[PDB]
Structures are given as C-alpha cells and as structure tokens.
Design a protein around this ligand. Sequence first.
Ligand code: 5CR
Ligand code: 5CR
Ligand code: 5CR
Ligand code: 5CR
Ligand code: MG
Ligand code: MG
Ligand code: MG
Ligand code: MG
Lengths: 367, 368, 367, 367
Amino acid sequence: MKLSGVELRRVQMPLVAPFRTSFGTQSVRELLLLRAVTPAGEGWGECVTMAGPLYSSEYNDGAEHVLRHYLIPALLAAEDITAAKVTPLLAKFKGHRMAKGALEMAVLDAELRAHERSFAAELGSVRDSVPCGVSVGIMDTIPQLLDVVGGYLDEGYVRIKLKIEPGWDVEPVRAVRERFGDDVLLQVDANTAYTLGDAPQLARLDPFGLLLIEQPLEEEDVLGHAELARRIQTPICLDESIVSARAAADAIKLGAVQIVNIKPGRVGGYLEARRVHDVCAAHGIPVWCGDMIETGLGRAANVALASLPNFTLPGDTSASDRYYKTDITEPFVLSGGHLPVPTGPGLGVAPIPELLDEVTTAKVWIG
Amino acid sequence: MKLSGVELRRVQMPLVAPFRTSFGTQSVRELLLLRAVTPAGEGWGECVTMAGPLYSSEYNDGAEHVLRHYLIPALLAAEDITAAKVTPLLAKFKGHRMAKGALEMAVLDAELRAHERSFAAELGSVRDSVPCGVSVGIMDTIPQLLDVVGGYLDEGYVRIKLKIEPGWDVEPVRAVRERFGDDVLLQVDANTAYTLGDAPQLARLDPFGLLLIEQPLEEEDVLGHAELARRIQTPICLDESIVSARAAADAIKLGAVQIVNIKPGRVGGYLEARRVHDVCAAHGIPVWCGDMIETGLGRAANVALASLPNFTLPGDTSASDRYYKTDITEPFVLSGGHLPVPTGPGLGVAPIPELLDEVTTAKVWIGS
Amino acid sequence: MKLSGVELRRVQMPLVAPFRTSFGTQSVRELLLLRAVTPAGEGWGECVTMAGPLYSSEYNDGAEHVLRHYLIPALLAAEDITAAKVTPLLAKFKGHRMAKGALEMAVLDAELRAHERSFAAELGSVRDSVPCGVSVGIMDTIPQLLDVVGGYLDEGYVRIKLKIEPGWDVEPVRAVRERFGDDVLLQVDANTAYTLGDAPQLARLDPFGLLLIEQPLEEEDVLGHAELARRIQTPICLDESIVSARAAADAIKLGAVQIVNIKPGRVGGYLEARRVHDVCAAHGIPVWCGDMIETGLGRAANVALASLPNFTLPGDTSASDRYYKTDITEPFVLSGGHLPVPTGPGLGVAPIPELLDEVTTAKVWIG
Amino acid sequence: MKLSGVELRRVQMPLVAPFRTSFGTQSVRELLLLRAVTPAGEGWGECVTMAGPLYSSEYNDGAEHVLRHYLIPALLAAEDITAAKVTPLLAKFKGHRMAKGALEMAVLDAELRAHERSFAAELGSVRDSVPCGVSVGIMDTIPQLLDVVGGYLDEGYVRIKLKIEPGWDVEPVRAVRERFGDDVLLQVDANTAYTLGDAPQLARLDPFGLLLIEQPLEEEDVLGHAELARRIQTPICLDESIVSARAAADAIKLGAVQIVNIKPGRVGGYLEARRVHDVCAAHGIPVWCGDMIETGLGRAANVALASLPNFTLPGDTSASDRYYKTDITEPFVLSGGHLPVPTGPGLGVAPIPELLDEVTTAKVWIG
Ligand SMILES: CC(=O)N[C@@H](Cc1ccccc1)C(=O)O
Ligand SMILES: CC(=O)N[C@@H](Cc1ccccc1)C(=O)O
Ligand SMILES: CC(=O)N[C@@H](Cc1ccccc1)C(=O)O
Ligand SMILES: CC(=O)N[C@@H](Cc1ccccc1)C(=O)O
Ligand SMILES: [Mg+2]
Ligand SMILES: [Mg+2]
Ligand SMILES: [Mg+2]
Ligand SMILES: [Mg+2]
C-alpha cells in the first residue's frame, strides 16, 4: 500500500467509576487515535499511552510529537508499505513502542481490510470467543472493595485481579478470600510498587492460592524478580518488563517469570505481541491479554489476540461498560463470562462518527 | 472455508545428477503432492518425505496412508477451517509432521488465494529476493568435487555446503579451501553420520573456518551436540533435531546449537516454521532455509519463508535447474546469486497441468 | 533550599568537522541548557539529548516538554530541595534519565556554589588532571581515517577510539595498526550496530590487541553480550545498556561486561554516575568517562567525574576544540595529553554571556 | 586544607547498665577521640575500638599507636588534603580500618565545616529523622529480659534486637514473642558465637518470624554463612564480615547475606560506608545502621548516615540515654521512635568542653 496520510486525534472519555492503581487515580481516559489513509481505504489504530509518564516513559503528548515528526514521515517517505515493513522502516528510532504499535495497528487494519481478512485470522485465532476477567482498583475501605468484587462476580466475570500497593495487599486479599471463598480465580497487580526488601510482606500472600502476582518490582529489575521468585510461593507475572519477545525470552531463561501479561502497545504492536505469545508457548509459559482501558478499537484487536492458543488464562479485556457508559464503536458485551471475537475485515469494528466527534478534543492531518 | 476434498498424487521427477548424502544416493525424486479443493478454489501442498525412512521415520507411503485415513478425514469433518485451526484439529494424532505440514500448506495456499494474499505477506517478508547457496553431494573423487563446486561458484551461488560422512570430511574440505580460498562461505552437513566418539575427527575441521557443521549426531541426541560444541570450534547447526519451536528453544537453552536450519515440512508446516524463526530470533540464533529437493511449489513457499528478517545466512533454496531439467511450475532462476520472492496470491506459482501429468505416477481423490 | 525557577535554553553550536557514527552524521550540535535559580544563587545544567531519538529514546523537544510539564513543576512544589532529593522527588516519572540528569546537574551546581565546593570535591576526586583520548568517526576512505588519527596522535591524545559499523570495522582497525603500530591504545565502538550472528566478523578483531569493543549489540540485549564475550577475545564495554548502577551490577553479574563507559546524562545524573563508579569498583570493573559532545559545562563536570579513583582508562573527554571552534565557557585545552580538573566552586566554569547569547535559539522561564 | 595536627584523647564513659554480648560484658565504654586541626578550624573523629581485641583485631592502644606512628604522620606529610584523598594517602598501610575511619571522620568534619555543609548533605540524606531500634544484651534470667524489653517498647523504640549466644537463643526469643506478640519487629545478633554445626539450633528460631540473624558465624567464614542460609529460614545479616564495599559485593554474590549492617568505623569510614550502602542498594540488599556505643559525635554521624535511601530497616542508633546518663555533646533524644538528623555544619554537634574534660583520661598532641 502507499500511505497517503494519517489523521491523529485526541479523545477524552469519562470513566464509569474512578480507577486507582499504585501510580494514581484516573477518572477520564485520554487517548490518541490514528486513522491511516491509503488510496484503497482506511485503518484505525489506538495508542495506549496515558496523559503523563506514570506507567511507562511514554505519554500522550510525547507519542503525538514522535508520530508527527518522526514515525509518520518515515512511513510517508517509503514506496510500498506493509504492516511487517513498519518495524524496519521505524527501527532507526529508539523506543517509542506504544506510538509505533498504534501506527502499526492502523496500517495493519487498512492492509487487512483490503484483503477482507480479520485481525483474528491474521494473528492465528483458534476460538470464537474468550473468557474475561476484570481488574479492580485500590479502594478507600475493605467493605467498598467487597461490594465491587461481588458486583463483578454477579455480572459473570471469570476472574478477579486486585491492584495492590504497600498498605493494601494482604488485607484486601484475605478479605476477598474470607467473603467469596477459595474457588474464585484471584490474582494481584503491584505496577512496580515493591522492592526486593519487601519479600517478607509479599510472602504473606502465599496461603491465599493466588494465580499470580503481577509486576511486583520495577520494570528494569529482572534479576530481582528471579530472586523474588525464590522467596515467595505465588507465581510471578511480568507486565512492564516485557517490552519485546527478546525481553520475554531473557526473563524466562533467568527464572524471573512463570506467566506473561501481553499488552500489544507495550511491546510495539500486535505483530510483536504474537511473537511474544510464540516465544512464551515454546517455553511452556502461559500468557494472558492485558488491558489499557482501550476504546472498542483496541478492545476488538485485544479480543482477537486473546483467542490465540497459548492464552490459557483469562485476560483483563472486560466489557466496554466496565469502563465506558458509551463506547465509540459498537460495544463489547459480556455473555456467559465471554466476549465474542470480531468476524469482519480488519479490526471488525470502526468508530461511529457522531460518537467519536462528541469525544474528540483535537485533530490534525499529517500528509 | 469448508474443505470439500483433497486429491493426492504421487510424482517422480528425475534429477539432473545423482545426489549422495550419508544415508544414500538419489537419482529420482519421488514425492507426494496435495491439491486441496474448497467451494471457492484450490491450493497446493507438497510433502517432503522420500520413498523410505532414511532421513526420518516418515516416508511417502506412510504419509499417504496417514493423510488418507486420519488427517484429511479430520479436516473434512470440521465446519469452517483455517490454516491455523489445522494444528488443533490434528493434535490428537502424534507425530507425522511432514504429512501434517503438507496438508497445512495446501490449506494455507487455498485460504490465502481467497484473500488475494501472498505466502510472503502472510509470513512477514521484509525483502523481495534472497541470496542462495547450494548443497553439494558426496562424490567418488576429490577432482570431481572441485569441478562441481567450481561450476556452482561460476553460476553465482553465494555459499557452498558439502555433504560429509566418515571417510569424506576433512579431505574434501581441505581440498575446497586449497583450490578456492578462504573467502568462500563454506559449511558441512553430516545428516546424523557421527557419534560423540568422533569428536577428534570433527575437531580436525577447526582450521578451515567453516560457518557451521550441520547435524553431526543423531536426531534425538541434543545433549550430545552440546557436549560436542565444547570439544570443537566449528558452530553447531541442527536440522533433524529441530522438530518444533519448543525443540528449538530446548536445544538453544542446552547449548546444543548456535544456528538453526529451518525446513517447514520437518517442523509440521510453514506456520510452525515461522514460530521456529521467531523463537530463534528472540534468542539471537540466526536461521537459514533448508531444502528437501522440492518442486517449484515447495520451492516457492521456501523462498517466501527465507525472506523473513532472521534468515541472515544463505539458504539451500537453489534454482530449479540445480535439481530438475524441467520443474512442474514456472522455474526459479538464479539472478545475481538471488531468487525472487513470488508476488502472486498464495504460493504465487501453480503446476503446469501437462508437465504435472507427465510426472504423475498415481492419483487418488479423498472427499466429495 | 527552595527552587525559585528554571530557565531553559536551546542552543545550536557548529562543529569544527562533521562527526559520523553508526546512527548518522552530525555537523551542528543542538542542545538544551538549564539555569536553575535558587535563593542561594544560580546553577547550570546541560542535557545530552540530540535532536532526534537515534542514540536513545530521549531527544531535545521531548526532554524540553517533560522538564517543563512534569519535572521542573515537581521540584518547584517541593519544600526542600537538595540534589540528593531530586531523585525521590522525580521517581514517580518513569525514564527520562537525560532530562532528569540535566536538572539534577543544575541543582547540584547551584547547591555546591553556595557551599563554595567544586564538583570534583563533591564526587571524590583523587587527582588534579586526567588523561584524555579521542573518539574518531566513520570516514569515506582509509587514507582519510589515517590522516585524522595521525593528527590526533600529534596533538597528544593518549588513546584512539574508532566508530565502527558493518562495512567499516576490521579494515580501519588493521590499517591503523599497520600505520601506527601495536603500542597505540586503541578501541572500537559500534553504537549497537551488530547482532550476535555477527560474532565471527567481530572475532576477526581479536589479533589487533584492542582495549575493548563498546556496545556491539542493542541496548536491551545484556545476555547477548555475555554470550558474545564467550565467542570473542576483545573485552566487552557497555555504554547504552548501562542506564543505572543497578543495570551495571546486573550486567556484571551476568558476565556481559568487563569495562563500563559512564555517561552521567545517560544514567540520570552525576550522583548516579558516582554510584555506577562505586558499584563497578567493588566488582573490579574499570570505568572510563564517556562524551556526548557537551559544551564546556558538561565537559567540566565530566573531567571532574573522570578524576575518581576507578577511572583507570582514558576517557572520551577531548579538548573543547576537538568539537567547537569557540566554546561557551572557558575552553578545555589539552596539555601533555591531559585536561585539568576545574578548581572553582560548582562546575568551576560558567557561560560567557555574550557567547551564550550568540548561539541561543530559544529561551523560556519556568517559575 | 593542610593538616596542622591532631589531638588524640582517651575517654571513659560509664554505661547506664552493663551491656553483655557473646564476647563479654561492658560496664564502661573506653574510646579514642581525634581532634583534627587545620589553619581554618577543627573537626572531630571517633574511633569505635574497644579496650581489647574481642570484637575485631583492632583495639584502643593499637589504634592509638598506628594513628600516632603511621597514619597521622602520612597525612601531615601531605601538602594537599581532602577527606577523599585520605584513602589513597593511607593505602600503603594494611588494615587498621577503624583507626583510618576515625581519622577520615575528623578530616571530613573539618572540611565540611569550612564549606558550611552537613554530614547528612555530604552523604546523600533523603529524610530529616530516622526510626530507631535498640540492642538488648544477654541477661541472667528471662523475667529480667522481658522487663528490659517492655521498658524499651514503652519508651517508643520501634524494633528490638537481642544479643544471643549458645545457651541463650531460642528461649529468650520464644519468651519475647509469648509476652509481646508477633507484631514487634524482632531480630537477633550472635557476634560470631556459632559454627555451621549449630545449624539445627539456629533453625529452631524459624517459627518466630525474626527479621534476621546477624553474624552467626565467624568474620572470615563467608561460605559458611551461605551454607547456613540454605539450612535456616531466618534471613542472614552480616556485620563483622562486611569490611568494605568489595566484601559486601562478594558476600552478596556468594549468597551469604540478605541484609547488611553498616558500621562506618568497621569499613574504614563514612565514605566507604556510603559505598557499601550504594553496592547493597544496587543488588537489592537492604541496609541498616549499626552502633558501637559511640558518643554523641559518632552518634550524630551515624544518624546522618542512617537517613540515606537504602537504610530501610531501623538501626541500632538508640538515644544517648540508652547508654549514657550524660553524653559529651548535646544528647540525642528519642521522639516518636525517631531521632532527628543534625542540621548544622559538619557533624552538627561538638563536645561540651567541661563534660569532655570530666571523662578524659589521657591526651596527646601530634603535630
Ligand atoms: C486494566 C489494568 O489494570 N490496566 C493496567 C494499569 C493501567 C491503569 C490506568 C490506565 C491504564 C493502565 C495494568 O494492567 O497495569
Ligand atoms: C539440499 C539438501 O542437502 N537437503 C537434505 C538432504 C535430503 C535430500 C533429499 C531428500 C531429503 C533430504 C538435507 O539438508 O539434509
Ligand atoms: C564522543 C562519542 O563517541 N560520543 C557518543 C555518540 C554521540 C554522538 C553525538 C551526540 C551524542 C552521542 C558515544 O560514545 O556513543
Ligand atoms: C549496639 C551493639 O549491639 N553493638 C555491637 C556490639 C558492641 C558492643 C560494645 C562495643 C562495641 C560493639 C554489635 O552490633 O555487634
Ligand atoms: Mg499490570
Ligand atoms: Mg541437513
Ligand atoms: Mg559509545
Ligand atoms: Mg552486630
């Protein structure tokens, strides 16, 4: 394809309830969307950056700037483009994985629409729907946490993940176990909030049968996680540290991880995400699909990815209404604890123009 | 896509010159081809078995049988099929990777034709052509070997691989180095002909600067290779042992391998092959494309596979005329030491009906 | 000490000769300078970013944005600032190490000036001058390389470093050895241009007695370097991979590095740089001081840093005129192959206001 | 700074209550103090030796002799002097770390006073007060132990350390746990009193949830401690073995230690101590500040050191009145379980001349 241009938009979508993590509290989701335009048709991408660099070094204004001044111009200057060629065309730019992933996603959506092929088919889907868990934030009190968890369990979510941080770990876990029992699939996520010195506190999670503890230590501390896995019984899962398939392989060989959370944007796109999946499967490491509170666009791509064979644990791809009263696409609706994999060409969904215009704060054409 | 049926044919194609390996001499290539038929269109697969179980346990009649009685029926019984779903549909059947790979190849060719998409685009090609080496058989004498190698070097092949076995290793290598010099890319391939007890003989290859030695020990002896790598300077490459992406990861972690030969049929198909490629790349292990003397059909798929980013050494996908006077497809022709990656839908090539009929020995229809 | 504000300036300084590396060619140095203002006085910092993200993910506009919107406001909101506290005050922001380092540098310069204390004394200097090498770019031809190298050797530089890349490695090295002999201190630097599959080409450097090969593989590939070190005789040095003292310790323990290049901006500042020095010294790993074509400001801080006890190989801190016809501070002048360690308070140099104004392209006050 | 001379004094300070360890009972603290005199002003150091070589090979008369005949003359012969240059000026003398450390401390106090800079600022303090534990000696009976511990807990000490030895380990620990409960921070210290053959006895401490067991085996037996860590659940802490940052790195790599007690005199001074802190932090090893029953002078320097970022467990820097009815400086007073980090120049404290004269037993001038 020849890329004619890309429209970049900033969108703001209010959340149904505030979402608190060890790095802070979010009440509105601000994001960047991309519309890649080729002579044949268009494709949509979604950046998973947030407003500030609190989860990783990338953030919305930074992703916008790098897309406008470096990444989109490199793609416009090439003759033929394909999604696979996006990686070597952008390889001279270090990092900026989320931005590159978004751009790749838009290119891939346009390419696959031209071949009348779904994301699911391109990625190697083996099932038509996927079981979905839910990620539950840090709360002000224990009774408020139990109400929220009970609510998600009644809606049919198959697994519960709790955000944890120092001063909110063992108690919320103990309380969820006391109230809802030992058969609920339960896990925790620290988003880098601990150090190796906290190993005795994290070992106090041992009796509760957690599936995993996700990213207890900082992003760059892979050996620290391997040392941590020698001191605790709960399996380690990595999120932030898994920036590439090579990073996954390294972490696996060092003993730092037993389960991997795959987030396509974090690894530089859906094509790298499939490679992470395949590296993990080859080492016997189960994977599950992460969530960055995406719109229906990212959600649809994630649901497709999550239908791959080594996604053997429930992902964080919850229904649209877990986060948004009104999505910009046709919404994802939970049915028997599952979401259906989209069947149309490309992502299988597209923004509803009037809904997208209501939440658009800015736009620019790069061409 | 519903599979309506598959035609299986047996083909016999005379080779331009006999091809001798440590497991014997071949003057005719006998193979199984598969034509998958769907309501929308057809796709071709090619099985890389030989007549008897000399390279691996699988062989032509065996592959034919398992395809007819187990693998094709399991696909005919499914409602919608995709090339990815072939693996879980056939997982209850142990082994038979080359047979499964052929079937997957045919399904993939048909699927991708329906989307007007090339094998290269599906697999993640980043280049439009690939540099090609050649594999050179065991000869009766040294002067005959040097003639053949000189000939391939004049045709523009960028790398030479020599078949070796006890009684034909160090001397042919020394002679090729003496006659053509130290700048030729050179490697050797034993096809499992040594044991760990031969480590001193294989260490005598050390001074010749070989890129690699391919599969010195038996298929199942991964630890033996890692022990061998501690006793010799030439990098170990595995072929027969690499049956899967998991096998590649295991061998890598054990220190048994530094470069991997990928053959899609040997690993159960092009989709597993891409996974092998990706596993290897994630560990810093270069890969190159192996060759099983395929027709233009397999050759086309191989050339597309060889255009992926971690194929950083020249493969064995030589021109059609290295093996066959006349191929059953449009032939691959060497140009500046390279072959072009096919651009059409699916494989980008298809059999020429009159040429295919001339070499068909037997045919059978399975399904409706 | 409270921070009153920070002035940020963009500067453009023409190079005396273009400088080519595996990631491209530079003829003008564009940089960000910081003037921190406190009630105790002013201090100067220098960011080592370039215009685009080619050496690392950080670049001038991105560093500027993050300093203005996140980092400088976090320091302005603090009740007490001391250079040591800058790190925990900015720890909530992920990455942006060069930006953080620049800000820390300016804070430190102001703080040390108030105490009439030099950078050298603060960092733990044990000597009054340091031996200096020179970094030599990729050239169009071999005879041009040998002319440049001969010229640096006549000026009295004690060590030669050659930029290398595929197609310019073994030949330039062989030629320098053939022309100038085996007693010249010689090393190479790839800036991440090779892969592990290139181990045979890099092993062809073995006979030439190189001090080291610097950063042959990509930034995130630590295990790859440890494998590389088992296949080649030339000691491995890391630059880009060494992002922190913790990264250094990890790389050392994994066998990935024998010598460490310390660049203070790359690790998030002079205080982390001293920690990298001390971690390396504790493991018996020599260090040397890297260079990012800094003005006299950065150069002065680097020369002080390079006077620490475990800096036992010559650094890349060349004389000012190796890069700039006219520096913005008093220039560093080579004498007997050495540069003198500055003796005044803080950095021991400051910009000459008229020279700085001539090269300033933009200025903003953040208060 | 040229050193004009040093006054060395011997001091004897009665303890409020005798303090029994596995190596014997102390009722009076005998120590060496140093007053370094430069043309600008003076600085105080404190040697942590005891009267005889029971804790380590160094003792008061030996430290005094080496200071007088080797160490102080080497510094007086040097034209240019800084605290950082003390190490290479004394490096030709093997060992005598506590003596070297005391001399470095005095030099540093004078240097920093001339720059109007606190120990805290020089070392890299990130907080203004530190939480303080207490070390409790071996008693004749269990009820006497429980009385003493209950008394320290009522005063607000945040952690209890028990001295242990064969015949006084499991029982005192069990009793403290039965009386005061599982939430008290509790650890033990053997001062080298066990052998690897006592692993079964030390494993009987496993059920009591101790933070650590400090130096169970002899000083030089690093591999023995790593073996011991495989046989017991209580984390191993080293004191006597950690004689340098390099020693710490070695012990960490061998698996011999999980937490490190830092004592500045033991490692050859406050500047080495900061290196130990930084080496440990880079390996994920928490540190805590040890106590050698110093006067207010050492105590002030320790409190500053204990305010560094990786001091994440409570130290043994108890209030002055834990040991001494009357200190020679302004006393450290516990407030809410914390001591305040001094804010003046240098140590931030100096001896009260009349109090110092009351406890001085001998004085000499070296000049
Ligand atoms: C669903 C969820 O927990 N997402 C992120 C955290 C996150 C929080 C806020 C905004 C985006 C992502 C995680 O898995 O770490
Ligand atoms: C081209 C070549 O040497 N191919 C096989 C040998 C072979 C020939 C024919 C049939 C099967 C295998 C190998 O690499 O082992
Ligand atoms: C002096 C030198 O070689 N500097 C950098 C490269 C560099 C060039 C230009 C600007 C910044 C960095 C290095 O050591 O990687
Ligand atoms: C406070 C304490 O227990 N100090 C020493 C013991 C000691 C007692 C008397 C004099 C010096 C050291 C230790 O931690 O080993
Ligand atoms: Mg997470
Ligand atoms: Mg082979
Ligand atoms: Mg460099
Ligand atoms: Mg002790």
